[PDB]
RNA sequence: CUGGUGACUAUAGCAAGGAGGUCACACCUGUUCCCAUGCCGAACACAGAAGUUAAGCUCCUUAGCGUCGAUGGUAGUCGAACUUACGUUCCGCUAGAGUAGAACGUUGCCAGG
RNA sequence: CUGGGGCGGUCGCCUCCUAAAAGGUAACGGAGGCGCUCAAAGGUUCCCUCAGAAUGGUUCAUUCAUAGAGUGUAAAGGCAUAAGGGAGCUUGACUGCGAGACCUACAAGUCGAGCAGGGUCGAAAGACGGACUUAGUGAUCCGGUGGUUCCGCAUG
RNA sequence: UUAUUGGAGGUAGAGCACUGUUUGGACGAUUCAGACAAACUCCGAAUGCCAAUAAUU
């Protein structure tokens, strides 16, 4: 989405990106998914900028369900200071995803119509990804 | 700007002191701690500040007590 | 007392009857009530509150105080067992509840067997005739009967006005 | 909806406070009381190895005569003095079972006290 | 608590037991009976 | 078989149904005494025994919640080799989750019967 | 001290995270607190159990409610043996110590069974050398005050 | 040093039982499903650590 309405601490140790994803690795509320295969931060705008592209293609219609939430806030220090002083701010919120990682489901749509608008989302993204379908056996 | 932290306390090495099956005289510490983390068992004593200790000599034996709680006790060498 | 000995015998067989038990002890035995005289005011009051309370009781009341400012003494509250219970019932049931208006109410149950009757003024019970102004005063009482319908017959049995 | 106690689980919780830090060697026994709307029994226990030393009841044909409970209670601390005695039991702790030390349990431990143990 | 106080015995004159308490809570020269070492007893011992 | 009193990581608890009070436990009837309520014999305490299994309590059948829980595999990881790849490989250890399944207690004394 | 110095900030103590499941462990790393308070908010004996929700009433009652309340105070660790709540009595918020142990460069700091003298509460076993625990503090030199079978420059 | 045995402790992982964060349903806050955490934990390794009595040193 964009970020948490409040945290209890808004200067983070920033999450470790090696690994598996641990959960969330299946299409659970729709037919079709955007898996991830490559490790990467992904930002409330990367997602926010995937969304309008894979909705807008839909032309609405379907529905939409965003897996990922940017729960981390990350900081960043002064153009131009020097180290030390302690930490900066907050510059943005970015959600962790490893290979696995369902980023987006869609449903409503046919089967042609969800490849195309996962596509376009995917070229917003930092990450590599596959088109997924519900798992059965 | 400036850092509002960089504060901290000495650290209060807290833990067990001896080993459970180590034999020990009276009065030897057998754990620090901050409130009864681990209860006083048979001929052990509770300090003032939590702090468990053998009133006897003898050998230490960490315990279970109930489903969630341990204790240790001290038993006299044979 | 005479309420006593009626639901001994009167409103003991009647409801045995009405809903079939097959042991007395299944039979309803309200337990007791509650004379709370609330006062929600910071002073002054609360000992005419005390007093109102002890004379409609003929026992003294404990001063109850808040739990959230705490410590300050808000309500006040008798409690009335056997004896006392069932003369003070049948005086609020033949003289006070007629004093005030027609009768009490048939949907205020706690919705387990325990009725919340709250009288609006001071005056309607046969004490403190004189007089400081109204109060809310509740009166609730409490049954052994797990059911709510198993208690409008033993008031009725009494001669509550349902 | 009047739900009402039970009086020996309530008392039974009151006996667990109380035996956290009382309990009956060999040298010094426990003497436990359990009391009940009619009978006071009474037993002395080891609690080390959980065995049972002595034992006499209000209930027992040898002291069940009318009297008062207090009066029978006196006669089980009496016949616990005597069991105590032909054990060879001196000195006990007495375990007052989570009841109040009054009436028929602290006549009792009067009885018990005043015919030769030690507590 | 406020102010640190002597408690000095009728017989003893050591002044052995300090201790404190709140001016505005304890205004009147609080005493107690603590042990005396040179009567071997519990006597009265007052604040200064 | 019941009770008193211990021990054990609820495998023991809760929940729903049914069966019982000969003694026993209990509910119960009262407040004179000992004692007792910031008020009330509700509780505590004391006399008791009109009665009643109605509830507690015992007993029985259920795996409904809770608890316990493998094997197999997966994650992680000690060590080694490769390597700089959000890593690979070998070796030992091996979760958590979930699955089959266990389970509606086992037992020490003391007394009664 | 300082990612040169200055300016800014900081300087002792307590709690947590970083800290890699013993302990320890840095940065001008991430968060907070202390320089007290309480004559009961200490000791002991006895008793007691919460927050919240639902439902009824011109605070009370019933039902659930393993604590989601409270614990003087920051946090953490503990606490229904209650360490939380109330009442009666009381002053152990004692004197002389102290096997042994923790911590530790030193100086310091910490815990302590148990012995003796005199008590408090409890029927009794027993508990009590302050407070659920861990901050609330400052060396030496000098000086003030109280006591003192000590010394006191030929002797008193 | 190793083997064996016992123990203290909460990291990796995992999980959502508590605190906080978050997505889509349902019913009228609770519930179903699915996620996130250095200062979350119903759980919990490998290792390392403390010890006790055999082999080597
Ligand atoms: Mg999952
Ligand atoms: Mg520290
Ligand atoms: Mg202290
Ligand atoms: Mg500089
Ligand atoms: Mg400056
Ligand atoms: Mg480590
Ligand atoms: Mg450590
Ligand atoms: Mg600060
Ligand atoms: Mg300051
Ligand atoms: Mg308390
Ligand atoms: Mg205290
Ligand atoms: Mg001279
Ligand atoms: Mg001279
Ligand atoms: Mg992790
Ligand atoms: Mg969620
Ligand atoms: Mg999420
Ligand atoms: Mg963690
Ligand atoms: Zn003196």
């Known amino acids: ?26 299409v659970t509320f729709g037919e079709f998914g955007l898996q991830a295969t490559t490790t990467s931060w992904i930002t409330s705008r990367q997602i926010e900028s995937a969304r309008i592209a894979m909705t807008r293609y839909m032309k609405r219609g379907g529905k939409v369900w965003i897996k990922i939430f940017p729960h981390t806030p990350y900081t960043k220090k002064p153009l131009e200071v020097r180290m030390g002083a302690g930490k900066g701010a907050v510059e943005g919120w970015i959600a962790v995803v490893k290979p696995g990682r369902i980023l987006f489901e869609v449903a409503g749509v046919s089967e042609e119509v969800a490849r195309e608008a996962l596509r376009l989302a995917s070229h917003k993204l930092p990450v590599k990804t596959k088109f997924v379908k519900r798992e059965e056996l | 700007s400036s850092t509002k932290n960089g504060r901290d306390s000495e650290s209060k090495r807290l833990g067990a002191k001896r080993a459970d099956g180590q034999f020990v005289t009276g009065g030897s510490i057998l754990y620090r701690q901050r409130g009864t983390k681990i209860y006083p068992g048979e001929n052990v004593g509770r300090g003032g500040d939590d702090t468990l200790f053998a009133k006897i000599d003898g050998v230490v034996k960490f315990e279970r007590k109930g489903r969630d709680k341990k204790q240790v006790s001290v038993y006299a060498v044979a | 007392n005479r309420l006593k000995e009626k639901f001994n015998t009167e409103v003991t067989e009647n409801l045995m009857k009405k809903f079939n038990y097959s042991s007395v002890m299944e039979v309803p035995k309200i337990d007791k009530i509650v004379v709370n005289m609330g006062v929600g005011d910071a002073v002054k009051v609360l000992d005419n509150a005390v007093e109102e309370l002890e004379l409609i009781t003929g026992q003294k009341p404990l001063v109850t105080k808040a739990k959230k400012r705490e410590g300050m003494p808000i ?88 | 909806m009047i739900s009402k106690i039970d009086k020996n689980k309530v008392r039974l919780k009151r006996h667990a406070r109380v035996r956290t830090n009382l309990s009956g060697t060999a040298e010094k026994p426990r003497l436990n009381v359990y009391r009940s709307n009619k009978h006071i029994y009474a037993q002395i226990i080891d609690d080390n190895k959980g065995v049972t030393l002595a034992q006499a009841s209000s209930k027992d044909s040898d002291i069940a005569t009318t009297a008062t409970k207090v009066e029978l209670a006196t006669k089980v601390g009496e016949a616990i003095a005597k069991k105590a005695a032909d054990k060879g039991i001196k000195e006990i702790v007495f375990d007052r079972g989570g009841y109040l030390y009054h009436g028929r349990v602290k006549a009792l431990a009067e009885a018990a006290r005043e015919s030769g143990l030690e507590f | 608590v406020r102010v640190n106080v002597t408690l000095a015995c009728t017989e003893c004159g050591d002044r052995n037991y300090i201790t404190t308490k709140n001016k505005r809570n304890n205004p009147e020269r609080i005493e107690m009976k603590k042990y005396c070492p040179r009567l071997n007893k519990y006597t009265l011992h007052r604040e200064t």
């Not at chain 3, 609006?120 to 403190?128: A, G, H, Y």
């Open chain 3, 75 to 162: 309500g006040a509250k008798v409690t009335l067992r056997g004896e006392r219970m069932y003369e003070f019932l049948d005086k609020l049931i033949s003289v006070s509840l007629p004093r005030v208006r027609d009768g009490v109410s048939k949907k205020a149950f706690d919705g387990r067997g325990n009725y919340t009757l709250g009288v609006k003024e001071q005056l309607i019970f046969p004490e403190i005739d004189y007089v400081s102004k109204v109060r809310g005063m509740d009166i609730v009482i409490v049954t052994t009967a797990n059911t709510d319908e198993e208690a409008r017959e033993l008031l009725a049995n009494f001669g509550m006005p349902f």
């Open chain 1, 1 to 26: 989405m964009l970020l948490p309405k409040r945290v209890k601490y808004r200067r983070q140790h920033r999450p470790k990106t090696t690994g598996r994803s641990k959960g969330g690795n299946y």
